[model samples]
Target: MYEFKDYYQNTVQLSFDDQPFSDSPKHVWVICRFGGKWLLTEHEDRGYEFPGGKVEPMECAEEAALREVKEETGARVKSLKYLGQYKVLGKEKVIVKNIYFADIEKLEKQADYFETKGPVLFHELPENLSRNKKFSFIMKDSVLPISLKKLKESGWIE
Candidate 1:
């Protein structure tokens, strides 16, 4: 478990979830990898960040993860695993998010990657991501590190 302030100074409460739950989280964040490198979507406004979006009506978190990754980066997920969940206590409202690790099968070229430019592959993330202007604040949070660690602990990564 972890607690901290987000980029907006909102309170963030995070916890790891090894077991799946029935309730679908409103949002899904996919920490994906393709061709042995990390995958991050290039947002038009938010710079580069993990592929994620809100769940649609009648859709589960798993479905949302797959759809969001396809729409954001055109990466097809071969394996999708739940990692953790977090809630952001924003000034206006509270947001619940489910974290996921996706092992991408391949990238399909498309005319449009809705809401994003497409995939940006990284051989390695920078050590000083908090100061990296190229990365979005979404990646500069505690959730990323915990997710990666969970992946390794769960034998999802080396």
Candidate 2:
């Protein structure tokens, strides 16, 4: 296990059975529809990122994702489907991320909690939302557009 330490990058310290590791904030990317458009976020960082945030103590990854979803967008996530994990290795440390995909059940309904940090813009992803810009590295698709398109066209989009 890795030791917990706050990195200058997006990674943060986490603990597992008293062991430490760097964790990228647990994130939830909602596939939502609003006003006949896709519910998306255009961050001032000048790119697109799903509504998500870090996990707190006593919270599972799923719960963290759910809370982040609600807190960031005022949208309740109905289901969270575990996608997989990601990692980035550096000369001194490594970062681990638990990825998840979720269904934004009611995209139009706004809950009490909403984040002021970024703009949850509704539309096609602004071409500038690259992984490199969001995560500090060369671009890697978080949810590849092809995959997103396929899912969007799938009956599950509802």
Candidate 3:
């Protein structure tokens, strides 16, 4: 378990580095595979979101990322790549999310993966996932892009 050291402040300012000292921000994110599909807490009419959570004060972005992945997915993973930094949409405060993309071998279904609500869906995109909204920052040519291209090539998607 990683520990957070930064104390809360008025405006959270994050430094683009390996360590986020007392001056680091208060939020972070982790992209992970649970079972085999993208994750998101099922909203009223939508599906699961990419795994992520708030960065504790003392926890560095990477540290918080790994911890968040495990805590959220219940799967152990190795860091694959850093997509980039992004701002979460529809938030009042300035929340900077340290986005990371990673993959895990095989994952067992955790009954409490999304303890808040909904079922832990594995593999394939959700049928009711919202398609109208776009994330604030999208990392181009990443897994999503590659996946889509492959899907289209195989006549899975148009």
**Highest lDDT scorer:** 1
Q: State the local distance difference test value for candidate 2.
A: 0.48
Give the count of colliding residue pairs in each prediction: 0, 1, 12
* Cα lDDT, model 1, residue 112: 98
What TM-score would you give candidate 3 relative to the actual structure? 0.53
- Compute each candidate's TM-score over C-alphas: 0.93, 0.54, 0.53
lDDT of 1 at 147: 75
- By descending lDDT, how would the candidates be arranged? 1, 2, 3
lDDT of 2 by residue, 1-158 (tens): 23222233443322222112324444333444444455445444534456555567778667887776666566656666654444444568554555456666664344443433433655565455453464312223433443364555655454
**Whole-model lDDT for model 3 versus the true structure?**
0.48
When summed lDDT is taken over every stretch of 10 residues in candidate 2, the lowest stretch is: 13-22
User: Residue 30, candidate 1: how far off, in angstroms?
Assistant: 0.3
Summarize candidate 1's per-residue lDDT along 1-158 as a digit string, tens digits.
68998876888888886423326578889999997799999999888999999989899888999999999998888999878888888899788898888899999998999889999999988887887888898888787887787788888886
Candidate 1 structure lDDT: 0.86
Candidate 1: Cα lDDT at 130: 80
List the candidate 1 regions with Cα displacement exceeding 4 Å.
Answer: 18-22
User: After best superposition, candidate 1 residue 117: deviation in angstroms?
Assistant: 0.6
CA lDDT of each candidate? 0.86, 0.48, 0.48
